[PDB]
Amino acid sequence: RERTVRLQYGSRVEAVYVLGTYLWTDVYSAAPAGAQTFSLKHSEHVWVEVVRDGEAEEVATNGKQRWLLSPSTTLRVTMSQASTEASSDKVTVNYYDEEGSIPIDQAGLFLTAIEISLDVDADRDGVVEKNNPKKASWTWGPEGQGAILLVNCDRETPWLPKEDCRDEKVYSKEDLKDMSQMILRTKGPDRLPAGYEIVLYISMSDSDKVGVFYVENPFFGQRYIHILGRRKLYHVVKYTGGSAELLFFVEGLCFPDEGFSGLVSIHVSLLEYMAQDIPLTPIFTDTVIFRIAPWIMTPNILPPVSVFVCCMKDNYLFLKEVKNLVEKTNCELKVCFRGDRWIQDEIEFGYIEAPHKGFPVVLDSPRKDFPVKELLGPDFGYVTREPESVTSLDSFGNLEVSPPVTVNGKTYPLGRILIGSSFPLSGGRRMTKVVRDFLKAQQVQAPVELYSDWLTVGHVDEFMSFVPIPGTKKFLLLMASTSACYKLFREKQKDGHGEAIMFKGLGGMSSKRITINKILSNESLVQENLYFQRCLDWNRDILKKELGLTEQDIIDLPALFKMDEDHRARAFFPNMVNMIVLDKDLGIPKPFGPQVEEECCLEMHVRGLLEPLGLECTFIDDISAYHKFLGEVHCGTNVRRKPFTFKWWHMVPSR
Amino acid sequence: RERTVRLQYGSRVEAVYVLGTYLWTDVYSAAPAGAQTFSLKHSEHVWVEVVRDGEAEEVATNGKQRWLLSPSTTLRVTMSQASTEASSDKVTVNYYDEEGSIPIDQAGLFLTAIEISLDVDADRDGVVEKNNPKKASWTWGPEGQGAILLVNCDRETPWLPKEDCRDEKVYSKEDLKDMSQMILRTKGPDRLPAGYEIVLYISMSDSDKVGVFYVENPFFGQRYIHILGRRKLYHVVKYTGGSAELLFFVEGLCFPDEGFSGLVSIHVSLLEYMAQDIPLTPIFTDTVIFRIAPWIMTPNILPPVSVFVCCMKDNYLFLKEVKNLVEKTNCELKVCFRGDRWIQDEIEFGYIEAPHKGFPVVLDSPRKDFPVKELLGPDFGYVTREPESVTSLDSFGNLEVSPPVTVNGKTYPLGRILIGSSFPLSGGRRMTKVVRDFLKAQQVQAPVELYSDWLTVGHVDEFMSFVPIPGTKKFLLLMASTSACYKLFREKQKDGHGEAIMFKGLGGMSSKRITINKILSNESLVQENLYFQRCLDWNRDILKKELGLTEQDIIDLPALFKMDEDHRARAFFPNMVNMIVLDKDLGIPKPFGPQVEEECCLEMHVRGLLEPLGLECTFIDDISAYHKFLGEVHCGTNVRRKPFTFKWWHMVPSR
Ligand SMILES: [Ca+2]
Ligand SMILES: [Ca+2]
Ligand SMILES: [Ca+2]
Ligand SMILES: [Ca+2]
Ligand SMILES: [Ca+2]
Numbered sequence A, B: 001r002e003r004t005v006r007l008q009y010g011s012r013v014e015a016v017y018v019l020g021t022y023l024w025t026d027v028y029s030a031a032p033a034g035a036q037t038f039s040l041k042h043s044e045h046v047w048v049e050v051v052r053d054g055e056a057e058e059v060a061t062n063g064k065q066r067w068l069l070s071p072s073t074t075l076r077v078t079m080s081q082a083s084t085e086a087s088s089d090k091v092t093v094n095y096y097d098e099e100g101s102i103p104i105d106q107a108g109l110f111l112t113a114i115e116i117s118l119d120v121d122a123d124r125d126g127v128v129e130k131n132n133p134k135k136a137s138w139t140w141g142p143e144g145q146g147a148i149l150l151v152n153c154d155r156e157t158p159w160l161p162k163e164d165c166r167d168e169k170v171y172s173k174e175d176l177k178d179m180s181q182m183i184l185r186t187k188g189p190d191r192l193p194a195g196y197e198i199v200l201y202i203s204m205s206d207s208d209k210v211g212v213f214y215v216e217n218p219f220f221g222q223r224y225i226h227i228l229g230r231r232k233l234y235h236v237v238k239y240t241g242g243s244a245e246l247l248f249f250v251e252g253l254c255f256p257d258e259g260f261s262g263l264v265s266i267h268v269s270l271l272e273y274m275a276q277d278i279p280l281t282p283i284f285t286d287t288v289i290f291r292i293a294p295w296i297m298t299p300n301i302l303p304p305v306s307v308f309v310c311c312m313k314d315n316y317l318f319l320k321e322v323k324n325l326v327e328k329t330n331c332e333l334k335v336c337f338r339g340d341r342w343i344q345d346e347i348e349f350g351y352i353e354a355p356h357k358g359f360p361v362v363l364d365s366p367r368k369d370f371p372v373k374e375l376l377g378p379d380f381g382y383v384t385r386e387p388e389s390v391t392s393l394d395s396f397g398n399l400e401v402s403p404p405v406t407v408n409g410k411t412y413p414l415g416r417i418l419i420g421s422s423f424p425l426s427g428g429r430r431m432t433k434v435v436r437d438f439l440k441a442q443q444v445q446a447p448v449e450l451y452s453d454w455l456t457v458g459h460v461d462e463f464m465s466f467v468p469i470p471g472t473k474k475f476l477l478l479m480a481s482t483s484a485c486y487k488l489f490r491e492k493q494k495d496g497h498g499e500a501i502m503f504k505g506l507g508g509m510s511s512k513r514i515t516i517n518k519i520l521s522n523e524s525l526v527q528e529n530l531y532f533q534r535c536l537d538w539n540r541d542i543l544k545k546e547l548g549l550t551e552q553d554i555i556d557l558p559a560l561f562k563m564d565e566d567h568r569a570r571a572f573f574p575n576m577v578n579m580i581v582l583d584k585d586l587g588i589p590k591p592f593g594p595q596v597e598e599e600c601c602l603e604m605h606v607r608g609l610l611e612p613l614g615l616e617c618t619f620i621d622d623i624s625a626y627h628k629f630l631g632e633v634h635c636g637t638n639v640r641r642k643p644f645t646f647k648w649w650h651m652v653p654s655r
C-alpha cells in the first residue's frame, strides 16, 4: 500500500513508517512561495525516488541534483528494515529560488520504521506463519487458506456447570489447547515515537462470537487476561522494542447459524494522537479472519469408539446381549440406568475439528423440561438450540446422516444430513426451524428432508439405516419394507405355517394368539400397510435421488405397522432397521416373529439377506422384560465414532 | 429420476407417468405365494426392460419369455410420448407355478403419460425456453444461468399512491411488461385420471417476496388473477388436455437485503389423492428459481439523460447558468422550486435490469418527517429503508459510486459504492445499518466506507468526485485540497496580490473585508486546514487502495474549510469538487475567490488543471441570491444517467 505523507511548510515532519508500505511525499506544498527548484539528502536506510509525472528516478544519499518544483513532481519513500536506537532515518529537502545555489529554506521528514504484523495459521498446518499474504481472506478447498477457530464448548474443570465459552474467564492452562493462536509480531526501537499506540480490536457484532486471551506470567503464577470479547471491543497493546512477539489465544463462542456465516475478524491498528477531543487516526491496520469450525455428524460407516446405552437396571437380557455384542469389537460400552430412549432421542454425537485440535461435541434436543448437560466434560463439548413449539420430529431419532456420496458428479465427502418432515402442503409436523437452520448453517453436510410424518413418533430411524459392506469402501441403505413382510408371511402360510405364533415368550401378548393366519386375514391391516409401503417408497425415491443410489445399494428388511387415528404408523413388531452398527457386527432388535422349525422366520430371513455380505447379525432382545410389545421401545443406544479422515475445510460447498 | 411403482397383489395398478422419469417396478410382491416364474406383455408406447440384479434386457410387446421370480429381478418402465385418447398404455405380468405353462394369476399396470414442465427464461434472452435443464439453479457470470425478476416498484397509474408491488392486484396490462414470464407446459389426454391434480406453490417465507398472476380473457374484458403471493401459498391448476400452456406473470416484491439473498423458488406438483384426512402425495415436482435484480447506482462517467435541479424560484443566475450549461448538451433539464438540497440529499437515482426490461429506480433517504414519493411513476420506481436514529450521514450526498475499476486483478465492472463514515473506535457518526445492509446486499457494487465524519455535514460529495477524461475510456478522481489553496494564495501574495478580496459582489460579506492577507495571517485557520488535509489524505489512500488508483488518476482542487466546536469542517468558500458532470461539460460551483486582474484566481487555477484534458468548465453561481456564504449551499442537482452496458448478471461477486 502507498501512503500519503506531506512535507510541511516549512516545519519538520516526524512520522512512523510501517514496513510493507511506502510513502508518496509531496515536497511542493512546503516550498516557500517563489521557489524554483529543490534538492534532497537522505540517510542510508531510507530509499528515495524522484517521481516526475509518473516517471521514477532513484536518488543518492547526498547528491547535488536539482529538479524543477512542480505539483506533479513528488517523492516516493521506502524502507526495508525497522529502525533501531542507532538509527537516524531521514529525508531532507532543500529549496532554491531563481537566483543563487544556496538553499532558501528546507523541509524534512524524520522517520521511525517499525514492523507490525498480526499473524495466524492461515495455511492450516497448526503453526503460525509470518504474515501470510492470504490471512485476511478465507477460502474453501484443498488450495484454500485462512485460519480456523473452534467453538470452545467443552468444559475443562467440573467445578463450574457451563461450557468454557459461556464466560470471559480462563482458569485451566489446558483450555488454551482448544484455542487458536494469533501472534502480534513487531520490530522497532525502544519506544514508539510520541503520540502513537497500537490497538487490537473487533466489531460490536463479532463481540459475542469470539474471545481473546493474553497469557501473563507474573510472580505468583500464570494468569489469563481476556482482552477482546463480550463488552471489550478494543485493547491497547503495550509496545516492547527490538523484535517482539505477543501471543494471543482465540476461542469461538458460537457455531454458524441463521444470520451468522461463521466468519469473524480481528484487527490491529497503529493510531496517531492528533489532539484532545479529536479521534485518533488509524495510520496502519492489519486484519486476520477466522472461520468457526462447523458441527459435523458421523455416519454409521465410521469406526465405532464408544457404545452408549440406556435401559432400566433390570432389563438383563438387553444388557447381556449388548455386552456380548460389544465384546466382539474393540469398542467400549457405557451404560446408564429424560425419556426411556433419551440417549438416542435427546443427544447426537458430532465433532468439530481445527488443524491443531478436534473433539466430539454433543448436540442436545430442544426442550423434557430440562437440558442434558451431564456429558459435558474435558474434550467432550455441548451445544443446543432453543425454539416454535417442539414435536416428536425434533427428537434426534429424527436426525441421521448418510455416508459420503457423489450425486450428479457433485461430491459430498462428509455425507448428507437427513431429517424427517411432512409434505409441503400437508400442514403436518416439521422439525423446528431453529434446529433446521442450525444444521443448514453448518453447510458441509448439506441436509435433505425426508418424509417421516406418516409415522406416529415421526423419526427417520424408524424406517431406514446405513451399513458398510465389509471388505469394501461401499455401503448399503437399509429400508423397512411391509411388502417384504407380507411376501414372507404368505410364503410361510402356503408352506403350512399359518398357525405359527408371534410374540412367543411375551406373556402379556399370549391371550391375543397372533398367528400368520390372523395377520394375513386382517383386511384393514393389509390396506394400512400397502399405504405405509407407498410412504416408504416415496422416501426410497428421494434417497436414491439425493444420495445418488441405485437399487443395487438397497436392502429391504421386513417390517409391519399398525395405523392410529391420525393415520400414522407404529411398529407392529420391533423395527429391525434401527440397529447398532459396529462395522461388520450388527445389533438388530429381536422381532419376535412367527416360529418355524423353532427359529424366528424374520430372524432367518434377515440373516439370509445380510450374512452373505459378510455382515454378522446379533439379535438383541429389549422387550422381554416388559412382557409385551405395544409399538414402543424402552431402550436406546448411540454410537460415538471416529471423525472423517477428510478435513472439512477441504470441501467446496455450493455458494 | 427413477420412481418406484409396485404391482399390487393381485389387483391392477393405475398410475400417472410423467415424461422425463422412469419407473422401477416390483413384480415379485404381487406374485401369488408359490409362483415360480413370470412373463409379460406391454403396449406399443411402453418400453419395458427386465432387470435381473443390475442387468437390463429389453422385452418385446408380446413375447412368451419367462424369468425366475426373484426380489432382485424387477422391471424398468419408460415412455417417450404423452398419452392421447387413442392410447391404451399398459404392462401386464403373468405368473406361473412349477407345474404347467398356463398363468395362475396376473397383475397389471395401466399408465397415463403426461408431460409437465414449469418453464422460465433461464438462459436470460427474454424468451421462455422449454424445460431448461438448469432452471432450478441460479449461477453468476457470462456462462451463468437462471431466471431474473424485477421488483415491481414503479407505478402504472397515478390514481393510486403506492408502488405496484404493494398490493395483490393488477389493473393495467402494461404492468405485465415489468413482470417475468413463467409458463406451465403440459401434454396429455382429455383429463387427468381420477384422484390427481396439479398444484403451483411457494414457501411461506417467499410469500412476501413474490406475486404471481394469471391472465384470463372472459366476456367483459381482460382480468388478472393473483394466484400466489401474500397469503396465497398454493393454487390448484385447471388441467387442459392436448398440448397446453398456461402463462403466468411473476413480480418481485422486494430487493435483496440483510437476511434475504434475492433468490426465490416456485414449484408445481402433481398430487395424488390417497383418501380423506390423508395428505395428498406429491407424485412429481418441478421447480424454477428466480433471482430478484439488485438496485444499481450510476457513476459520473455514464451518459447523462436528465438533470434534476432544485432551488428557490428567484435564484435567477443559478437557473440561467444551469440552463445554459445543459443547452451545451443533449440532456433535459427538470426544475423544482424537504431540505433546500433535497434533490441531491434525499434521493439517489439507480436502476434495475432484467433481460426483458429495465427502468430507473429512486432510492429515498430515511426519515424529513415525510417520504418523497412524487417521482414515483410509470417506469420510474421507488424504494426506501426505514431505521437507529438518522444523522446527516444518512443523506445521499453521503452516497456515491466509482466508475468501473480493477483492483489486485479483481474486476468491479459496475464500480464500487462509496459512503462516508467515522473511524471504527471513534464513536463518531455512521450511516444507519439498515441502509448500509441494503447497499451491501445488492452485492454488485461491493461498497467501501470512506471517512466523512471530519465534516460538519459529513458527506463524501463535499470532498470528492469523478470525471471522465474526454476522448478516452479513463477517468479522474477529483479531491478537495487545502494545501493546493494555501499554495496558490501564498503565490498570489508573493506576487503582490495579498490585498485581493474574496466574496466580491456578495453584499453581506463586504464588512468582513476578507483578503488573501487576512486568510494567510490567520494562524488557527492554518492549523485547522493542515488537519483537514490529513483527513483528505487518509481518504486519498483508501480510494487509491480500494479503487486501484495511482497519483496519475487524481487531480487536487483548491478548497478551504473552517472548523466548528466539534472540530468538524465546513466550506470557507463553495466546494468546487461537488459539480455537475455531463460528459466533457462540468458545472462547477462558483468559488468567489480573490480577484486578480479581474478574474477569480480559483476559477483560473481550476481551468488550468481541467481544460488541458478537454474538460470544459462552466462556473455556476448558486450563492449570489443569498448575498453571502456561510458554508451552506441552498441548491441541489442530481443527474439521471443511462445504465451500464455491462449486464449485472455477468458479474461474478465474491462468495
Ligand atoms: Ca501455518
Ligand atoms: Ca472460559
Ligand atoms: Ca475448553
Ligand atoms: Ca479441551
Ligand atoms: Ca440420530
Ligand SMILES: [Ca+2]
Pocket: B120, B121, B122, B123, B124, B125, B126, B127, B128, B129
Ligand atoms: Ca430464454
Ligand SMILES: [Ca+2]
Pocket: B163, B164, B165, B166, B167, B168, B169, B170, B171
Ligand atoms: Ca399491483
Ligand SMILES: [Ca+2]
Pocket: B152, B153, B154, B155, B156, B164, B174, B175, B178
Ligand atoms: Ca409496474
Ligand SMILES: [Ca+2]
Pocket: B154, B156, B174, B175, B177, B178, B378, B379
Ligand atoms: Ca412499468
Ligand SMILES: [Ca+2]
Pocket: B344, B348, B396, B397, B398, B399, B400
Ligand atoms: Ca449521491
